[PDB]
Amino acid sequence: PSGARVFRYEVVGLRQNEETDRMEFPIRRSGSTFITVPYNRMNEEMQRITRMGGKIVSITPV
Amino acid sequence: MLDAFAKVVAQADARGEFLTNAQFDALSNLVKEGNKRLDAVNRITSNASTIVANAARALFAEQPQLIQPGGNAYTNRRMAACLRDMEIILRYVTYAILAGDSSVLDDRCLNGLRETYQALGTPGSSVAVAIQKMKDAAIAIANDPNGITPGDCSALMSEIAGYFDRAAAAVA
Amino acid sequence: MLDAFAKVVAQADARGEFLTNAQFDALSNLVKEGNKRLDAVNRITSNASTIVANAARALFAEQPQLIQPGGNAYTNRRMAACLRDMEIILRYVTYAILAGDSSVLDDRCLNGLRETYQALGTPGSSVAVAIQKMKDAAIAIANDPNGITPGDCSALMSEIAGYFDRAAAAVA
Amino acid sequence: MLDAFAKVVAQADARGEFLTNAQFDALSNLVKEGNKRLDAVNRITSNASTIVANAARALFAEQPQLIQPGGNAYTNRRMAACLRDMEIILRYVTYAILAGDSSVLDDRCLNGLRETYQALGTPGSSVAVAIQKMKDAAIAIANDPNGITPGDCSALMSEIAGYFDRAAAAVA
Amino acid sequence: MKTPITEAIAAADTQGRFLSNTELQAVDGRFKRAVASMEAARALTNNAQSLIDGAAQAVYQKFPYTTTMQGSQYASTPEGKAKCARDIGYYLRMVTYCLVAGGTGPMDEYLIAGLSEINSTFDLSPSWYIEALKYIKANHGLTGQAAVEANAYIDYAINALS
Amino acid sequence: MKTPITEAIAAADTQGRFLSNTELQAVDGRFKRAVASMEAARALTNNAQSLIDGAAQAVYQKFPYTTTMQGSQYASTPEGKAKCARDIGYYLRMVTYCLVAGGTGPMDEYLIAGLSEINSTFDLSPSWYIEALKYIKANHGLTGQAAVEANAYIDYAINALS
Amino acid sequence: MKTPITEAIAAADTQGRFLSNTELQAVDGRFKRAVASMEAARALTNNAQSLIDGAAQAVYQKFPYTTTMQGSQYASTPEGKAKCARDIGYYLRMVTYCLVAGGTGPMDEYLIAGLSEINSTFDLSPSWYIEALKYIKANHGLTGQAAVEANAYIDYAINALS
Amino acid sequence: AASRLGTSAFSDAPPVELRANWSEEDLETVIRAVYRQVLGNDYVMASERLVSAESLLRNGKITVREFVRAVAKSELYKEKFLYGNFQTRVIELNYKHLLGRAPYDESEVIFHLDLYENEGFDADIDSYIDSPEYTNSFGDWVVPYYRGFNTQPGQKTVGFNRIFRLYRGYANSDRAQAEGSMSRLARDLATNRANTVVPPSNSDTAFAYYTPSADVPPRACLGGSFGESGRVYRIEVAGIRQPGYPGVRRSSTAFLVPYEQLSAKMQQLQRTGARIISVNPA
Ligand SMILES: CCC1=C(C)/C(=C/C2=NC(=C\c3[nH]c(/C=C4\NC(=O)[C@H](C)[C@H]4CC)c(C)c3CCC(=O)O)/C(CCC(=O)O)=C2C)NC1=O
Ligand SMILES: CCC1=C(C)/C(=C/C2=NC(=C\c3[nH]c(/C=C4\NC(=O)[C@H](C)[C@H]4CC)c(C)c3CCC(=O)O)/C(CCC(=O)O)=C2C)NC1=O
Ligand SMILES: CCC1=C(C)/C(=C/C2=NC(=C\c3[nH]c(/C=C4\NC(=O)[C@H](C)[C@H]4CC)c(C)c3CCC(=O)O)/C(CCC(=O)O)=C2C)NC1=O
Ligand SMILES: CCC1=C(C)/C(=C/C2=NC(=C\c3[nH]c(/C=C4\NC(=O)[C@H](C)[C@H]4CC)c(C)c3CCC(=O)O)/C(CCC(=O)O)=C2C)NC1=O
Ligand SMILES: CCC1=C(C)/C(=C/C2=NC(=C\c3[nH]c(/C=C4\NC(=O)[C@H](C)[C@H]4CC)c(C)c3CCC(=O)O)/C(CCC(=O)O)=C2C)NC1=O
Ligand SMILES: CCC1=C(C)/C(=C/C2=NC(=C\c3[nH]c(/C=C4\NC(=O)[C@H](C)[C@H]4CC)c(C)c3CCC(=O)O)/C(CCC(=O)O)=C2C)NC1=O
Ligand SMILES: CCC1=C(C)/C(=C/C2=NC(=C\c3[nH]c(/C=C4\NC(=O)[C@H](C)[C@H]4CC)c(C)c3CCC(=O)O)/C(CCC(=O)O)=C2C)NC1=O
Ligand SMILES: CCC1=C(C)/C(=C/C2=NC(=C\c3[nH]c(/C=C4\NC(=O)[C@H](C)[C@H]4CC)c(C)c3CCC(=O)O)/C(CCC(=O)O)=C2C)NC1=O
Ligand SMILES: CCC1=C(C)/C(=C/C2=NC(=C\c3[nH]c(/C=C4\NC(=O)[C@H](C)[C@H]4CC)c(C)c3CCC(=O)O)/C(CCC(=O)O)=C2C)NC1=O
Ligand SMILES: CCC1=C(C)/C(=C/C2=NC(=C\c3[nH]c(/C=C4\NC(=O)[C@H](C)[C@H]4CC)c(C)c3CCC(=O)O)/C(CCC(=O)O)=C2C)NC1=O
Ligand SMILES: CCC1=C(C)/C(=C/C2=NC(=C\c3[nH]c(/C=C4\NC(=O)[C@H](C)[C@H]4CC)c(C)c3CCC(=O)O)/C(CCC(=O)O)=C2C)NC1=O
Ligand SMILES: CCC1=C(C)/C(=C\C2=NC(=C\c3[nH]c(/C=C4\NC(=O)[C@H](C)[C@H]4CC)c(C)c3CCC(=O)O)/C(CCC(=O)O)=C2C)NC1=O
């Protein structure tokens, strides 16, 4: 209903320490990370991941 | 993200050598014609809405399957989404034009846009056609001979076309 | 996370059998040599900073490409990152020594560590060389026979070497 | 999230054609037997606890391997999880029976559940057997004629069974 | 698990610092107490069968109704008596795991979690196992600080069931 | 990096709107000042070798103990003198980069990030680099607004070391 | 502070009235006397060290028992002699402050503000400071209007101590 | 100065991200801490815990950010705070529970309220959850903590004052507080008015000092006061009960007193039993 139908995102290793120095928690692992994103927040989540840096390897509709 | 000045500084940092005289003069030339860049971005942003609207009309005339029932742009909600994404790619290309380098265009946005469409089922080829329609629209509005002090801007026009092409190739 | 005691009891619980007499005496042997284990970890942790610093100087002397402009241990930010990760490996190996098992070394380190280095483009082989330098430093400091009660702790030293080797093999 | 009525309208929207007479009479049949559907869901929901409990006793008798130490059900934490998931599947299938379609059941409950169990190591085949146990229990108490206005609704019972079967097949 | 060793390690890990003398002192205490702890574990395991059967009879005597009333949650049937033996055996095996691990880690992770859920769904009232554990705590036949620690773990289980 | 153009782009990106006239005016001012900035950068790089050598001697004179004290973190050895000629050169190079970039972006990404950590691990003293930067700021030999910008970046580094 | 200027201001403020001719006349008298007042203050501060030293010796001669008798109140130790010098210095500094303020305000606020209470709690005798002030009043080496005003303030302190 | 102010020990950060994200025990701790921070230390009964969210939480399908949002938008959270309080008060509670701070200026209320009025409450919680502050201070793997005590982020000084209005003790819960059922930081937020810090109770008498400026002397003396030497010290008090002639009236109040009289006034106040909240120069 213009929702549900969640999409899984797979993220390339965030190099970090590049425009994300301000982030309070130190990232503990880069890449090989899968984030369940819902359809309704998909727009925002793209913005966030890409703003942090890195890339998206693959997107699988589940 | 990088801009023209940042791009040359970053390459020089990778080698570890002070910027050579040639690089200095190149960037001075770029800044000497920067007013052209500013004019182009100003005109494109002032005509954003008409650019996207005209390109959309052309796209749905060329590929009617999209607006036929059961097609990917049908139901008026997906039509809104389609218009939104056309404007989004225009906005990021505008960012790139002001920067002078396509680094920002490929670093944010078009970073898996192909993948997102491929997962959604949206035809990437049709998106490419739409990007081309917008390419012609934007190059026309930025190259209009009337309303400004005369001169040459063809170099920047080819650059703008290059950015639109990069987007079209990356999304399809 | 399962330390040595926890590891043996967990496998015995999976099989569903009361701890057998052999397992009891193995654990009693572990406790009988526990003081030695504590002493070794105390001595390693007391010189942690010097160990990491000296090993780092040696690594950058033996492989100057890292600190040359354009190499991965250049820019002073990546240098800080490299020092941080060397000391992190030392910290988790000391955790492992105190535990008596490698569970902590594999959980919260080395698990999805090879992939991170591989994606960043940092040479994993060089990381392994650094771990080996720290291995020699730590084994020497942990077997220093001056300033302490006499004994033989060669078994524990071999165990320490095994932990370091496991890490170096996992990253390279 | 669709129901039966929403399902027919969504299909018709995909085709772009007004609701056909066949679909109209189908939905009229659905509403004419609506009270039956409500009674069935009420009976299953009222006896949810006993259905799950009895089915659980039966399952851990027909596959003692799961309960025997080292089986994905020992540890009393995993036992709680198993009961929890049996009840979860019953809950979403009751949602489905009230709705009249399987969209709700496959959108949340069994939307990738197979992969989750495959990674966990819990045998999906045994989970399907448990769902079948619940199926027979629920069918029996929904078809219990003792204390309600009589009338044969074998069709509704077959639909309930179909939804349970869809879940059981999707998890295994 | 919550084993003293790994609790100290986790305490240092959350603060991202090398093991200080605080954690080393803790582990030292664990090793000091381990002599008595292992003695207690050996004692409980060596006479495990005797204590298990005694506890089964104790529960049967304290709650006679559990051996007569018909139902799945009773030991009226021989299969029910077998399951009762299995459960009390589980409790004793877990306490002997906890003794050797050095803390209440095993009892917490392999038992005591969702125990309320299970005891409520299958209608096994905790009081039965509580009385069984009480019998074990009275007949364990240990002495000294070994007896103290074994009792402490048993009573942790008792209070958790309550 | 934090280049004026890119920060304007990021400011528009966070709001999600096309570049308004305010941002365009800002980048126009950047382009107007770029001619002087690049002239100053050419001047700084043309006399870079003399500046680096003079700064190395200045720190040797301000801290004679650093040229006599034995140890890795001292210039008492020829290898240490090479390291001085490397690091002071890096700082001057970064100043030229900042001048070209019109902002402190390069300085932050390639120098200031983690500078605190490095000066403590390798036992370097920030005062050394501070004195060297002061020499550079006095012998840069620039004039006008371009001189103002260059001195601003140098002082940014000085205050970051402190 | 009860400076003549501020006294007039306060008198006008309690009545919420603009400064009348009477207040202006008073302040004019202040300024007329200020020339002599400032001359006297300059003279006292030019000889400050000599005056304090001489007063110290004066009390050492007038009360020899204070330089031998044991007790914290007595200067039978170098620290106690320092305390004597410090206090007579306080008195001289307050006199200079009152000279520049043109009134007794400073003397009342930073001294003569429980001087009785403090000397009594410590049990120190007022006579000590009275004789010290007398020496200063005779050795100030002033003549004319400046002399009369300075001696008046010193005597104010003397009679306030009693 | 820790015990009196109330910050007993809030001196670390509990992440759940790990190879053993469950960690077999640590996940229990993380779930508890999220419940304590999001639900305002409310005593959640076992039956009404959000089991569905925890399922995905251990599975790794959802991160800590998603868990916090799930609790925040679940009806468990709504019944306690959202439905039952003035909307502005709800905005304050959201800032306390999700971003670990207090509203720094009126614009915060403007923005969040407009979201609620048009988009709905779900969108309001969304804005808190994905605001840059939540994304930075916490990291989708770090339980929110009260970072308002620490000043590192960059904030108006008033923030410190204001957070101590919302946090009235380690034991306290926002469902149960002295001034509850009405806005706690609303009248002040419009006027950008500072608040005196009310220490939470600690094994001594407590008198919650409400500070409505409707009937109080101004923060400054705004005059010469008595005119005696020295400035004018403003003394607050709460529990005045002994001298009730019509009933004392305005039991909690402040008096601007000239310096010389302070001592006398002090004893008078102590005689009535009110414990002086503050003595600030005016
Ligand atoms: C506590 C658990 C933990 C581990 C295990 C860990 C490892 C780790 N090291 C990293 C990076 C890194 N590791 C190095 C290390 C090296 N540079 C070299 O020249 C050498 C060959 C090598 C050291 C011997 C560097 C330079 C980076 C940063 C890469 C970059 O900024 O481009 C990264 C990438 C993201 C980041 O910078 O944090 C991770 C995740 N981080 C963690 O939080
Ligand atoms: C800010 C960067 C950004 C980009 C680039 C982006 C793309 C993007 N466009 C989307 C939707 C969409 N995009 C389109 C686009 C098109 N449909 C057509 O017929 C044409 C071929 C084409 C336009 C010419 C459509 C139809 C949808 C809706 C898909 C659906 O849910 O059915 C979605 C799915 C979520 C949603 O918005 O519903 C994403 C992620 N999202 C972003 O956040
Ligand atoms: C606030 C941001 C800003 C804008 C937008 C701006 C406009 C601007 N465009 C200019 C020049 C110009 N404008 C154009 C524009 C064109 N010439 C053509 O033949 C094409 C058809 C067209 C491309 C769009 C050209 C070629 C110049 C020549 C000067 C130069 O290249 O720098 C000039 C300098 C001379 C003049 O006033 O015309 C200004 C000030 N100035 C600003 O500060
Ligand atoms: C707070 C944590 C902690 C530490 C650090 C510690 C040290 C410690 N080391 C001890 C003994 C000892 N320590 C050693 C250690 C060594 N023998 C060797 O040949 C090696 C070179 C070295 C090990 C690498 C030996 C042999 C003993 C005595 C015998 C034994 O306890 O096994 C003892 C027991 C007798 C004593 O020395 O008082 C203590 C208490 N105790 C602690 O509770
Ligand atoms: C290691 C952690 C652990 C515990 C504690 C555990 C207990 C446990 N005991 C059970 C059954 C049972 N246990 C008993 C035992 C008893 N009968 C009696 O008369 C006594 C009063 C009592 C012994 C003290 C009975 C009768 C059942 C069957 C209940 C039923 O089917 O309704 C069941 C239900 C499933 C089954 O039949 O196995 C569980 C989960 N399982 C575990 O994995
Ligand atoms: C691109 C930016 C950048 C900076 C700033 C930087 C600093 C830096 N200086 C270093 C060392 C050093 N730095 C010096 C510098 C000095 N010795 C003195 O006596 C003087 C007072 C002072 C120079 C004027 C020395 C001697 C070393 C070697 C110390 C060692 O090997 O232990 C090292 C350790 C690695 C090495 O031996 O080179 C780093 C990383 N590295 C960088 O990549
Ligand atoms: C500016 C206003 C001001 C005044 C007036 C002043 C006086 C003054 N003198 C003091 C003590 C003292 N003063 C002396 C001085 C003396 N020893 C002698 O032999 C002499 C007779 C005498 C000098 C005339 C001594 C010995 C003490 C210490 C007495 C004690 O500790 O009990 C003390 C007690 C606290 C202390 O130990 O300093 C005060 C307050 N302090 C002030 O701030
Ligand atoms: C969409 C609603 C939903 C589902 C379906 C779901 C499934 C689900 N079941 C789980 C656990 C589990 N599920 C079982 C289930 C079984 N064990 C058996 O022997 C049987 C064959 C079977 C029951 C019939 C077990 C044993 C675990 C525990 C795994 C473990 O912690 O080791 C887990 C692991 C994490 C956790 O326990 O929270 C998930 C995610 N979670 C959900 O939110
Ligand atoms: C319980 C739900 C709820 C209410 C009722 C509420 C009231 C409320 N109304 C406000 C604004 C306002 N409200 C009014 C109201 C009026 N002005 C007039 O002239 C009329 C007489 C009257 C309307 C008929 C005005 C003028 C403002 C703007 C005040 C300002 O910006 O200074 C503000 C200020 C913050 C902002 O503008 O965002 C609040 C908090 N807030 C709430 O969460
Ligand atoms: C860890 C330190 C700590 C303490 C002590 C604490 C107390 C505390 N007790 C509460 C409730 C309560 N406290 C009681 C207490 C009692 N009622 C009685 O009749 C008895 C006389 C008495 C028990 C001896 C009751 C009944 C509630 C529930 C009220 C309610 O939620 O409606 C509440 C809030 C309402 C809720 O439960 O959600 C808090 C915050 N909070 C803390 O964080
Ligand atoms: C003319 C306007 C006016 C009001 C409104 C007023 C209220 C008022 N009531 C008071 C006392 C009090 N008021 C109450 C009232 C109550 N006790 C209860 O148990 C109930 C819950 C509640 C009534 C239903 C009590 C108990 C006190 C005495 C408090 C004490 O001595 O500690 C006091 C404290 C001082 C005193 O007793 O004189 C004030 C100021 N005084 C006023 O002059
Ligand atoms: C408004 C609140 C509400 C109610 C009352 C409800 C159930 C419900 N069950 C009903 C009857 C019934 N319940 C049954 C159940 C059965 N009997 C059998 O012998 C079969 C084995 C089986 C069919 C599977 C039957 C046949 C009827 C009469 C026909 C019907 O209306 O469903 C009816 C119609 C007559 C009546 O009011 O009882 C309702 C409304 N669902 C609701 O939401």
From Swiss-Prot, chain A:
The keyword Membrane applies. One of its GO terms (cellular component) is phycobilisome. Its main location: membrane. The keyword Membrane applies. It is found in: Cellular thylakoid membrane. It is a peripheral membrane protein. It comes from the Bacteria. Residues 4-62 form the CpcD-like domain. Keywords: Antenna complex, Membrane, Photosynthesis, Phycobilisome, Thylakoid. GO terms for biological process: photosynthesis. Belongs to the phycobilisome linker protein family. Rod linker protein, associated with phycocyanin. Linker polypeptides determine the state of aggregation and the location of the disk-shaped phycobiliprotein units within the phycobilisome and modulate their spectroscopic properties in order to mediate a directed and optimal energy transfer. This is Phycobilisome 8.9 kDa linker polypeptide, phycocyanin-associated, rod. It comes from Thermosynechococcus vestitus (strain NIES-2133 / IAM M-273 / BP-1). The gene is cpcD. The chain holds residues 14 to 75 of 78 of the full protein.
Swiss-Prot record, chains B, C, D:
Pfam families: Phycobilisome. GO terms for cellular component: phycobilisome; plasma membrane-derived thylakoid membrane. (2R,3E)-phycocyanobilin 1 binds at C82. Keywords: Antenna complex, Bile pigment, Chromophore, Electron transport, Membrane, Methylation, Photosynthesis, Phycobilisome, Thylakoid, Transport. The keyword Transport applies. Its main location: membrane. The modification N4-methylasparagine is found at N72. It is a peripheral membrane protein. Contains two covalently linked bilin chromophores. Light-harvesting photosynthetic bile pigment-protein from the phycobiliprotein complex (phycobilisome, PBS). Phycocyanin is the major phycobiliprotein in the PBS rod. Belongs to the phycobiliprotein family. NCBIfam families: phycocy_beta (TIGR01339). Heterodimer of an alpha and a beta subunit, which further assembles into trimers. The trimers assemble into hexamers. This is C-phycocyanin beta subunit. It comes from Thermosynechococcus vestitus (strain NIES-2133 / IAM M-273 / BP-1). The lineage of its organism: Bacteria, Bacillati, Cyanobacteriota, Cyanophyceae, Acaryochloridales. The gene is cpcB.
Swiss-Prot record, chains E, F, G:
It is a peripheral membrane protein. Contains one covalently linked phycocyanobilin chromophore. It comes from the Bacteria. Its main location: membrane. Keywords: Antenna complex, Bile pigment, Chromophore, Electron transport, Membrane, Photosynthesis, Phycobilisome, Thylakoid, Transport. NCBIfam families: phycocy_alpha (TIGR01338). This is C-phycocyanin alpha subunit. It comes from Thermosynechococcus vestitus (strain NIES-2133 / IAM M-273 / BP-1). The gene is cpcA.
From Swiss-Prot, chain H:
GO terms for cellular component: phycobilisome; plasma membrane-derived thylakoid membrane. Keywords: Antenna complex, Membrane, Photosynthesis, Phycobilisome, Thylakoid. Residues 1-175 form the PBS-linker domain. Residues 230-282 form the CpcD-like domain. It is a peripheral membrane protein. InterPro entries: CpcD-like_dom, PBS_linker_dom, PBS_linker_sf, Phycobilisome. It comes from the Bacteria. Its main location: membrane. The keyword Glycoprotein does not apply. Pfam families: CpcD, PBS_linker_poly. It is found in: Cellular thylakoid membrane. Belongs to the phycobilisome linker protein family. Rod linker protein, associated with phycocyanin. Linker polypeptides determine the state of aggregation and the location of the disk-shaped phycobiliprotein units within the phycobilisome and modulate their spectroscopic properties in order to mediate a directed and optimal energy transfer. This is Phycobilisome 32.1 kDa linker polypeptide, phycocyanin-associated, rod. It comes from Thermosynechococcus vestitus (strain NIES-2133 / IAM M-273 / BP-1). The gene is cpcC.
